[PDB]
Amino acid sequence: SYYHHHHHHLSDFYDPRERDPSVSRRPQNRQSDEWIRELLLRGTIARVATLWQGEDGAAFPFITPLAYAYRPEQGDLVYATNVVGRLRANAGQGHPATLEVSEIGQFLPSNSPLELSVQYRSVMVFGTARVLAGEDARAALTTLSERVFPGLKVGETTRPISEDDLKRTSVYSLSIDRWSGKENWAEQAIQEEDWPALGPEWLG
Amino acid sequence: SYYHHHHHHLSDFYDPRERDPSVSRRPQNRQSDEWIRELLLRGTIARVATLWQGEDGAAFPFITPLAYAYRPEQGDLVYATNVVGRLRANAGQGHPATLEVSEIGQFLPSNSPLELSVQYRSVMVFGTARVLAGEDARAALTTLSERVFPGLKVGETTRPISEDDLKRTSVYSLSIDRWSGKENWAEQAIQEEDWPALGPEWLG
């Protein structure tokens, strides 16, 4: 019978592999805090998401790519942006903020469609951002500027940061609560042995 | 008197310039819809921000970098990610989503500290994302995959997308409501004529 026939017609996990005993055993691609710190110190572009009140009166996120600097001692990150919405969806002089920094490598081809991927390292940072004023703002802008242009010195390379400058710039400190680090940086995607192998134009 | 003395001690805007009559007159670096479409068609990485319920019971955004494809006819963008939080801060079978795509160029040095900058093109997309099922999910994954790996064909280059595959993947359609395009892509930052000029190690 068809029913029976069809019913009848309808593991590398447990088999030998090599493993480097130094490699992180953390699940879901998770990384250490030290790894996260290191990634943050070497990045220069971040995306910040903050929440703004919309037409329907519901909160919705913006995402703004911007220059940033991580200040480990202070326990914050600083950035400047004049981007805003109408009213923040927030009760306070500060507002919750998520900051993302990543290193995006190569797309990784496969003859298996769900193993298709991209190399990445990515950190989400959760905290509260506040706007800075006066010397607080000047120093944070200085640190920012000198971080993202190595060798530049404010007051030598550039004219000093003036009171007009400060008046015209919104500079923020994002005080860190929590963070979360992820890495998926294989040399090659997992392939399917039982489908024809990717040709030379792929992995060559 | 000091008071008086200090009181006494305490424009290129309106003067001649050249202008290309073809250049956009839109304020705040804003771009056309056609420009936006074009940027979206050529990008392959996006950041998506969606809202999740936190410990204090307040909504907070995630930001996830991911592969995407824009489908102009359908009026959506598609992506796959298994990233989640606990509960979405959302009433529905779909959830509000902001999607960002950018092209980040070079940092642009200046001898004026507030003219320091980076070349950028950036689009924010606002809409509602929904999870796809069955052939809907297979087709969207296919389009995604073949977009981000030009020349790849699902079912030839790769084995077909199976029912197990679909079971294990969350594939979304972000139906577009509104979008917003920005460009700041100068060849050189504005400099201060009255401070020493940046040396050769900067602009050379």
Contact between B124 and A62 using a beta-carbon 8 Å cutoff: yes
Contacts 24+ apart (CB under 8 A), B145-153: B145/A113, B145/A116, B147/B44, B147/B69, B148/A107, B148/A116, B148/B44, B148/B67, B148/B69, B149/A107, B149/A109, B149/A116, B151/A201, B152/A109, B152/A116
* Residue in B closest to A66 by C-alpha: B118
Strand A171-184 with A76-80, pairing: antiparallel
DSSP-assigned letter for residue A31? -
Q: Locate breaks in chain B with C to N over 2.5 A; list the residue preceding each.
A: 10
Please choose, from the candidates B60, B61, B180, the residue with its C-alpha nearest in 3D space to the C-alpha of residue A83: B180
Under 8 Å between Cβ of B49 and A61: yes
Residue length of chain A? 204
Helix (H) or strand (E) holding B48: strand B45-53
For B55, residues 6+ apart whose C-beta sits below 8 A from its C-beta are none
d(CA A107, CA B64): 17
What is the C-alpha to C-alpha distance for residues A56 and A21, in angstroms, rounded to an integer? 53
Interface test with B, best of A28, A47, A114, A123 (most B CBs within 10 A): A114
The SS3 call for residue B107 is strand
Q: Are B58 and B78 in contact (CB under 8 A)?
A: no
Rounded Cα gap, residues A176 and A167, in angstroms: 26
Q: CB neighbours (10 Å) of residue B100?
A: 25
DSSP bridge pairs for A172? A79, A131
**Residue B107 to residue A149, Cβ atoms within 8 A:** yes
- 3-state secondary structure at position B15: coil
Question: Contacts of residue A165 in chain B, CB cutoff 8 Å?
Answer: 113-114
Q: How far apart are CA A81 and CA A83, in angstroms?
A: 5
State the CB neighbour count (10 A cutoff) for residue B33.
Answer: 9
The β-bridge partners of A76 are A71, A175
157-196 in chain B: CB under 8 A from chain A? 157-161, 165, 168-169, 192, 194-195
**Beta carbons within 8 Å of A62's beta carbon, 6+ residues apart:** A49, A50, A51, A52, A83, A85, B49, B98, B124
Q: Which of B63, B89, B161 sits opposite A63 (nearest CB)?
A: B63
The distance of Cα A133 from the centroid of its chain, to the nearest Å, equals 27
Instruction: Among B95, B106, B116, pick the best mutation site for testing chain A contact (most A Cβ within 10 A).
Output: B116
Cβ(B134)–Cβ(B141) below 8 Å: no
Spacing of C-alpha A15 from chain mean position: 35
Residue closest to A97 by CA, chosen among A44, A50, A29: A50
Q: How far apart are CA B138 and CA B143, in angstroms?
A: 9
Q: Which of residues 107-126 of B touch A (CB under 8 A)?
A: 107, 109-114, 116, 118, 120, 122, 124, 126
> B45: closest CA among B125, B119, B99?
B99
Interface of A with B in 67-86 (CB under 8 A): 67
CA B126 – CA B131 distance, rounded (Å): 16
State both tokens at B155.
């079912």
Judge: A60–B98 Cβ closer than 8 Å, yes or no.
yes
Separation of alpha carbons A60 and A53, rounded Å = 6
Residue A130, beta-bridge partner list: A94, A173
- Which two three-digit tokens encode residue B149? 């790996």
- Smallest CA-to-CA distance from B148 within B46, B74, B48, B64 is with B46
Place of tokens 């009026």: B75
> How many beta-carbon pairs below 8 A join chains A and B?
144
- Residues A98 and A176: beta-carbon distance below 8 Å: no
| d(C-alpha A62, C-alpha B97), whole Å | 10
Structural biology method used: X-ray
- Taking the C-alpha atoms of residue A69 and residue B84, their distance in angstroms, rounded to an integer, is 27
B151: left (phi over 0), alpha (psi -120 to 50) or beta: left
| A19 Cα distance to chain centroid | 28
Domains of chain B (ranges; CATH) run 1-204 (2.30.110.10)
3-state DSSP of A136-162: HHHHHHHHHHHHHCCCCCECCCECCCC
Cβ–Cβ < 8 Å for A181, A35: yes
Element (H, E) at A7: helix A2-9
CB A137 within 8 A of CB A169: yes
Residues in chain B: 204
Measure the CA–CA gap between A39 and A42, rounded to whole angstroms.
Answer: 5
Task: Mark B35-68 as b/e (b = at least 16 C-beta within 10 Å).
Answer: bbeebbeebbbbbbbbbbeeeeebbbbbbbbbbb
Q: Which of A158, A163, A195 to mutate to test binding with chain B, by most B CBs within 10 Å of its CB?
A: A158
Rounded CA-CA distance B50/B62 in Å is 6
Q: Say how far apart CA A24 and CA A118 lie, in whole Å.
A: 20
CA distances for B174 relative to B69, B94, B102, B132, angstroms: 10, 9, 18, 10
Q: How does strand B59-71 pair with strand B45-53?
A: antiparallel
Resolution in A: 1.9
Quick check: B59 contacting A, CB < 8 Å?
Answer: yes
Q: Tokens at residue B88, please?
A: 């979405």
Shortest Cα distance from B47 to chain A (angstroms)? 8
Contacts of residue B48, defined as CB under 8 A and 6 or more positions apart, other chains included, come to B63, B64, B66, B68, B79, B81, B97, B98, B99, B100, B129, B174
Residues in CB range of B153: below 8 A, 6 or more apart: B146
Structural tokens at position B175: 């139906």
- CA–CA dist A170, A166 (Å, integer): 8
**Residue B40 neighbours by CB under 8 Å, 6+ apart:** B70, B77, B101, B123, B125
